[PDB]
Swiss-Prot record:
GO cellular component: extracellular region
GO MF assignments: RNA binding; RNA endonuclease activity
Subcellular location: Secreted
Function: Hydrolyzes phosphodiester bonds in RNA, poly- and oligoribonucleotides resulting in 3'-nucleoside monophosphates via 2',3'-cyclophosphate intermediates.
Name under which the protein is recorded: Ribonuclease
Organism: Bacillus amyloliquefaciens (Bacillus velezensis)
Amino acid sequence: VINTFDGVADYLQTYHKLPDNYITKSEAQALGWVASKGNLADVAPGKSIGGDIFSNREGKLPGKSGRTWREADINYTSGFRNSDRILYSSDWLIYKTTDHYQTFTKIR
């Protein structure tokens, strides 16, 4: 399981995909995840949420025609989700947030 800022950031820039321990919220829901119960580890042990599109509505991340931003949870192990996310563009800019998408800083 690769779920560290550095680990995932490097994996993404190289292989251009998230490591196989990631699933989208959609996928997780189909497996019986209930966000309000914090039960993701019960129904999908070893998995973390990640790969969903991030809408960047506050336009805090640098925009660009054709550029798409996605997110993945970092440091998740069990229970309710934390506030740590990796944000990555289709042109492999990598940003991080530890404060629920309020502030972002570049890590690659």
